[PDB]
């Protein structure tokens, strides 16, 4: 049961932070890109290395310690960082044509913010069920062919980073309660990017009964994807290319019962 | 049915939750999710795709609490695409956009489509080619005719079975379907970008004009959903189309009737 | 004419409730809803197109319940594409979209038109070529100069039969039509996606700023369409409008006028 | 300078309602509404195109009835191109898609830009290239220099006369204008398909953020336009702008001024 | 600072009007709006752009009248880019469509930003490529590692420098900006087609959730913009990016502030 909210200058407190990409980071100078896409002979041998593969990013932030109040949060300020990188246009790209510039990152993007008082809650999905996922990711296991559409055999929680494939992961709707996410997939092999960037747009995290994420233990999780597309370099290979995402959210004591 | 007041109470109101998985034509035990590769006819009169090359409507009746005069009453829908981001295997036996690039995502035409009714979706049958000769163990339009490849009122059905009614005949009937709520969208084209957004805070209220939402007849709920994101090409260039589950979650209340 | 109050009471409305097929040219007894084979003038001189190439705009004179004064007054519309999923058929001669791909879907040039008026569609001529030769059995400009490729106030006419007036020819006139409300797109470019939305929840106001709807004159009502979805191309490269049929659903209540 | 009460009675109010013919270029006496085809300079320094090849501005002053102090204040606009259809001749001269396809249609950059207001729309010279040659009987920014390419506060002009104007090296005044309303959007691309809207049921409020219209000095309405669509394409490949007509509906109103 | 009432009478508004001039590189006598033609480096480590082919963020700094605590609140923008229409030059030296057709627009990659603010904006920096070595005569992330491809708190700085900032490194600090409004689109893609809108019946309000618009520190106001409108082709193939001038209109009211 939740209860009446708490008024003063004590009553009111504010996170902000940003969230780094995981991309794959293929080597010491690449972070923010995945290694190059190399594709399988068929279903049965896709077997993508770690370092290929893009996963969800999650923080866990604490909060002032309270104590029952909690702490609830009620505004999202969100966007991405560095959008004007992209317009590296000169450096190992391949040509859009005969002494052209470089071709800029586009093609399939994911772009996802969650605003929770737990762990994001996820269901597995395969494109298809026999890839072999490599060790150091969190994938579905006992994976069939049901896995392929649904198989609700396949939960976790976003609680480590670097760890689960976006590719093998979605939200779960069919929990969530206490997490307020926001995602679209962008496909097709060269779809372009839009970034829009600007301090003045909010988001309201309270539910329909005026309720936002409450914070469980005085933690505050914020989840992101932000896979902005491939880039192409000079010899055609191509490598996924994420960004950082910022965070700011506003939050209020909240009392509850039980 | 003159419809009368709902009723109060912490027991006048129930959820039904669920998630719908595609029909997409499983042409063998790895491929769920996918139909058979697309083959072309020489001519119209020759049309005659095989069973497995053909997406179906997808469809759930799902019983309610008994009542009995009250009726349940479907007031409110969440829905979503579930695997959005299994898109981002493109690792897979798929065609490179050019030399040495990334397998190309799903991409091509879409049929994204979802309704909630007290009573099975009311179909029209429409053919894009009179001649197709639809296969056993599908429901199509019969005795078709030149008229039907624009409108013959001979084609009526209703969706009372899975795996059964094709995409490509089957569409909606707007002169009926008074107690169903449908929404639906083509987007065509031979390369066109998936566009998929996911959320926990978008609700589709499911009233009319005079506040009333679809009453379950004989205390069922149907739920009909077709989730077709495009095709996959793999190595050789064949295509096939890719579907995905359908989360519902819909809250009904107890309203009285005569 | 002074309009007065709407009349109330149960006996006081109507609706009206139809599907307006297309008229594209049905070149033989197989092909009712498609053009015939685009063909390409060498000159704009030489444009002579026949009859069964060129789309034409669908009407129907619906007669109302008789009244003497009264008029119906035309005050909601709801309507809809019927058989948007028939564009996936890409398994019928179409054109592969490369080497062993899928046939391509219906795209390129669209424009979906509808009206409700109390009277008929009023038409001005515009030709892209004022030197084209319009086909014997079709309704067109007629005296047109070089000026009748921007405005030539002289080709003005009704849309008063069928399977007469052709799409390219002729636009609602913008300077008549009070007694009429007309929506259209054309959406250009050679290959473009088509985008179809269908739902029965979407409901068009045709009252005017004034609060008043089209009034139907000797009690008919006035339905037009056109629904040129895109060009099929079939396993030839040869390309051919495809049209669908579109339903409407009229409210119409009494008025009194003097 | 000071606006006081706006006059009432059946006399307060008056309507204009006209077209607006483009002016394209006009290549010879069969090409009314299309420009010369498109040639392309070897350098900026050579770039000298003939007037034909040039679309301008289109304006109207529109004379009202006499009043005197009263002013007419233009309040609301009903705005359309007029013809959008023709570009469905994809029959004429046009160059094919592909092997035995259809034409290509009208696409690429357009123009669509109107204005209403109480004296001529104000100009702002800007060049793409400062050393273009603007020909004889055009209305160009002179003194150009090298600044001309981004700003240079000294091509100011009035668009008084019509195929004068060269669209490509004029803009509204944005730090002038306070007595006329605009609109425009330039869409790019080099082939970006054109979407046209038309519709009787829209209309545009001229008012200013005090409720304020343009006020008509001398009793003369002012109403320009650009309705560049694209580009056509002939068989040889070379391309050429296709403008069509705009019209206006115009409702005014006493306004007394001191 | 408290924000207190809001003063009135005839003298207690005032308006700012101007146009900022892109930055593009500049790289002759004959191209101001336009880069050097783009070159691509052979590796990520070879990355070493000059200083005409980098577009660099535009700011002004406008003087108010001269106030005394009253601050001039800014309330209200108008904004748009100005010539539009000159990207319908399509036959002075451009790549064909295709054989006989029309010179390529310009298209591609844009970025269209502006900011209003009563300091100078604030930026963070981000790195494409870490290694890459910037020019002289500009101001970007300096001690760049690894880290700055993503996020590295070190690269902070004001937009407080005409032709000098680069638009590839930096993006206003959303972290700071109190005393600033801001709005960015960047449309990536290889050939996009730029769409431009222009009226002068749209304004943007500039205050806050609480009813506040940026307070002009020292009566100054600032304005900056970037509008990268993509890339012209030539004949030979060779791209370059090509930007425009932005106005802006500015609608400010004295403010009465507390300490």
Redesign the interface.
């Known amino acids: 049961e939740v209860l009446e909210v708490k008024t003063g200058v004590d009553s009111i407190t504010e996170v ?1 932070c ?1 969230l ?2 995981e991309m794959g980071d293929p080597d ?6 995945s290694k190059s ?8 041998s ?1 077997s ?1 290395n770690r370092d ?1 593969l ?1 996963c969800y990013s999650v923080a866990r932030i604490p909060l002032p310690n309270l104590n029952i109040l909690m702490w609830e949060a009620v505004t999202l ?1 969100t ?1 991405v ?13 391949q ?14 993007s ?1 772009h ?1 913010f969650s605003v929770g008082g737990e762990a994001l809650e996820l ?1 597995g ?7 072999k996922y490599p060790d150091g990711t969190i994938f579905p296991k006992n994976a069939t ?2 896995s ?3 198989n609700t055999e396949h939960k976790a929680y976003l609680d480590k980073n670097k760890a689960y494939p ?6 779960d ?2 929990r ?1 309660e206490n ?22 747009a ?1 988001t309201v995290l309270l ?2 009964f005026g309720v936002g994420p409450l914070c469980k233990g005085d933690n505050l999780y914020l989840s992101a994807v932000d ?4 880039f ?1 370099n ?5 490598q996924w290319r ?3 995402r ?1 965070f ?1 959210v506003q939050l209020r004591k909240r009392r509850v019962k039980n």
Not at 28 to 33: A, D, P, S, T, V
Not at 125 to 131: A, D, E, I, K, W
């Open positions: 902000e940003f780094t990409p010491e100078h690449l972070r923010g890109f896409i190399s594709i399988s002979d068929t279903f049965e896709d993508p290929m893009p300020k966007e960082i560095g959008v004007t990188s992209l317009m590296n246009v000169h450096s190992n790209g040509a859009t044509h005969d002494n052209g510039a470089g071709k800029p990152v586009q093609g399939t994911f996802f269901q999905v395969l494109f298809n069920y026999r890839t062919v049901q392929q559409v649904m976006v590719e093998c992961w979605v939200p709707p069919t969530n997490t307020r996410y926001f995602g679209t997939l962008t496909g097709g092999e060269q779809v372009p990017p839009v970034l829009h960037i600007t301090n003045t909010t539910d329909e896979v902005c597309g491939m192409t000079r010899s055609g290979s191509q994420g960004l950082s910022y700011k």
